[PDB]
Design a protein around this ligand. Structure first.
Ligand SMILES: C[C@H](c1cccc2ccccc12)[C@H](NS(=O)(=O)c1ccc(Br)cc1)c1n[nH]c(=O)o1
Ligand SMILES: Cc1cn([C@H]2C[C@H](O)[C@@H](COP(=O)(O)OP(=O)(O)OP(=O)(O)O)O2)c(=O)[nH]c1=O
Ligand SMILES: [Mg+2]
Length: 656
């Protein structure tokens, strides 16, 4: 595959123009061969700027950087990231990167080139939609969106459905909070009828997701477990059953109050409620939620009572069957959100890393990028935290520009992003960083470096956001927020950061100028970009020693350098489903370093998530890998994560 990749890049170079401004002119002049219609594939404002600075821009680009991409990463770029004219790729990766850089920075050519170099050297990456759409007409640069139901009426349900349609069309994933919609059997005063509840409503969402493609629609549906239709909700993804009791193309998440977990643990009863009868449960959290909920129980405003454990069993069994629902702890998400001055946060997003406020007037937006953590390790096996912080500042300014540039699919999204200016900086290559540092994932050394990486990210992000506020003013809803009061994320976990960074001085800078962004950090999945860049995904442990059979480059390098490589090892790894643990020739220090996600404790995975979690103001797309699951294991895992203070206790459950 190494030679294959070079030939394919060489072929693309052969088959494309060299000069960036030339390619930009061809893209802009494009004429539809069917229509004879002039449909520019790049925006005029962007072309104007490129032609006006063509010598600097053209001569900045380093075409040899195209050879950096591995075989499958490059094919993925050819497949979806490089603009085509009549089915033939016109952009080199370098062209697309500069198109992106100018797309974000406009007149600021200094800025564009700095971004172009970071991106082309692979220090970080913008999100797929940004890479698709930057520098094009009506550019939709943001990844995903959150929304609440407008109202518990046919009017509201269908207006919200139209929003999802429009957003899906513009290539956004969606998280939707549905708990305010009344349940099965509940009275409808305007028709003198009774509601059929959530399921048939969700079947309309399900078919709308099948209908409207991203640029299939990906809608995660969020429900709080007090809702009367909670048991049916839990069946919607299952492969068995009647079509009318199924919504199999949606994704499912629970927005879990502390009270539920406490009542499961102490084996108490659990009241199911109808939201028309028991209003506002979704608009309070913590103690205020607890009081309200118990008050409705004392008022008899309850439709059904079950054992908390019977609903617990249903949740776990659904996860055993489908890997879902996702597990979010509502009170952890609200109690530790810088956005908590806005009101109660009703849901997360499609990938469970975004925690942002949504109302009938506001659709929250996820503005995302990831840092390639592997790049910050020196030949010395030391971590360049200073460089990591420096790159993080660049990314904050870039995402901040994206908020003002973005073409919003609905006006509610524009209003939310404009008022709160949240961003989500994540990571990839965490497992690679540890491997490069020679630290096993579970080691104490990895554990300290995990904290310190995320301390650095948060610090650098805050610093750039603060400089932005000094330059532009704080975001609109800043005063009255926890950070305006001197409360940073780790304080809300009661965590004292290491001595690596000077938080006292940063807090003084923030007390004086404030900050530009209500939120900053959010480790997202990185499924596409990690494969483009050749890193392990996001914060995940090592997936496998093999992925054409491509042995992991780091392992291959280490075994080659020791004299221990033999081409036979390939098939032994395959026979061991990606493991190197039972290969006798490989030394123990290497076996430890290259343990797979299936050989790594999930308890330590959750702990390490909680640990970094103190420095992540949003949440984290945290998958859980349990080869051989059972109810005790899942129970233990969820309760452990809940009690660690995790916002997102579980994204996907994976097994084998
Ligand atoms: C489910 C269980 C668990 C996951 C999280 C928190 C826990 C908290 C308390 C008790 C169990 C918990 C998990 N079981 S597991 O998936 O079979 C497994 C065990 C060891 C290794 Br190595 C890899 C996978 C586990 N990880 N570590 C540990 O001790 O258990
Ligand atoms: C009319 C109708 C409503 N519903 C649901 C949609 C909402 O969740 C809920 C109320 O719909 P609404 O459209 O609010 O009905 P309404 O205003 O006539 O009556 P009320 O004053 O009681 O609101 O009932 C159905 O599930 N099926 C139906 O055929
Ligand atoms: Mg009504």
């Amino acid at each position: 595959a190494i030679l294959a990749a070079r030939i394919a890049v060489s072929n693309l170079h052969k088959e494309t123009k060299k000069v960036f401004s030339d390619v930009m002119e061809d893209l802009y002049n494009y004429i539809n061969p069917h229509n004879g219609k002039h449909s520019p594939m790049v925006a005029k404002s962007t072309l104007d700027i490129v032609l006006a600075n063509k010598d600097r821009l053209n001569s900045a680009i380093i075409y040899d950087r195209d050879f950096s991409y591995n075989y499958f990463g490059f094919k993925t770029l050819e497949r979806s990231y490089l603009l085509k004219i009549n089915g033939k790729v016109a952009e080199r990766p370098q062209h697309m990167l500069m198109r992106v850089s100018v797309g974000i920075h406009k007149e600021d050519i200094d800025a564009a080139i700095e971004t172009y170099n970071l991106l082309s050297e692979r220090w970080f990456t913008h999100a797929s939609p940004t890479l698709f759409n930057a520098g094009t007409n009506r550019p939709q640069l943001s990844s995903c969106f959150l929304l609440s139901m407008k109202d518990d009426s046919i009017e509201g349900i269908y207006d919200t459905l139209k929003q999802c349609a429009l957003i899906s069309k513009s290539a956004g994933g969606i998280g939707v909070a549905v708990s305010c919609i009344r349940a099965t059997g509940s009275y409808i005063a305007g028709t003198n009828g009774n509601s059929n509840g959530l399921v048939p409503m969700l079947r309309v969402y399900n078919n709308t997701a099948r209908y409207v493609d991203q640029g299939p629609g990906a809608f995660a549906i969020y429900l709080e477990p007090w809702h009367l239709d909670i048991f049916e909700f839990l069946d919607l993804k299952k492969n068995t059953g009647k079509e009318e009791q199924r919504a199999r193309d949606l994704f499912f998440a629970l927005w879990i109050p502390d009270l539920f977990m406490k009542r499961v643990e102490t084996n108490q009863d659990w009241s199911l409620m109808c939201p028309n009868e028991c209003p506002g449960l979704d608009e309070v959290w913590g103690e205020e939620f607890e009081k309200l909920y118990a008050s409705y129980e004392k008022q008899g405003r309850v439709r059904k009572v079950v054992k908390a454990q019977q609903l617990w069993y249903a949740i776990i069994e659904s996860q055993t069957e489908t890997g879902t629902p996702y597990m979010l702890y509502k009170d952890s998400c609200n109690r530790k959100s810088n956005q908590q001055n806005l009101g109660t946060i009703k849901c997360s997003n499609l990938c469970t890393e975004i925690v942002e406020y949504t109302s009938k007037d506001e659709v929250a937006v996820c503005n995302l990028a990831s840092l390639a953590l592997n790049m910050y390790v020196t030949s010395e096996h030391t971590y360049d935290f200073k460089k990591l912080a420096e790159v993080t500042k660049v990314v904050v300014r870039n995402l901040n520009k994206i908020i003002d540039i973005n073409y919003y699919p609905v006006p509610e999204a524009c209003l939310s992003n404009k008022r709160h200016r949240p961003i989500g900086i994540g990571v990839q290559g965490l497992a690679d960083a540890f491997i490069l540092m020679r630290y096993p994932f579970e080691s104490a050394e990895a554990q300290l470096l995990n904290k310190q990486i995320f301390e650095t990210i948060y610090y650098g992000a805050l610093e750039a956001s603060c400089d932005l506020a000094k330059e532009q003013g704080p975001y609109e809803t800043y005063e009255g927020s926890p950070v305006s009061k001197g409360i940073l994320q780790y304080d809300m976990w009661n965590v004292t950061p290491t001595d690596l960074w000077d938080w006292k001085v940063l807090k003084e800078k923030i007390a004086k100028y404030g900050i530009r962004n209500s939120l900053l950090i959010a480790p997202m999945p990185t499924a596409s970009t990690a494969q483009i860049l050749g890193n392990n995904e996001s914060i995940e442990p090592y997936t496998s020693n093999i992925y054409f059979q491509i042995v992991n480059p780091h392992l291959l390098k280490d075994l080659t350098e020791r004299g221990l490589w033999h081409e036979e090892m390939k098939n032994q790894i395959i026979a061991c489903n990606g493991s190197i643990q039972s290969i006798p020739e490989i030394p123990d220090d290497l076996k430890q370093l290259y343990k797979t996600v299936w050989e790594i404790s999930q308890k330590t995975v959750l702990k390490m998530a909680a640990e970094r979690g103190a420095f992540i103001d949003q949440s984290q797309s945290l998958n859980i890998h349990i080869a051989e699951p059972n109810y005790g294991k899942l129970t233990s895992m969820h309760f452990y994560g809940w009690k660690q203070g995790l916002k997102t206790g579980m994204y996907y459950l994976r097994t084998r």
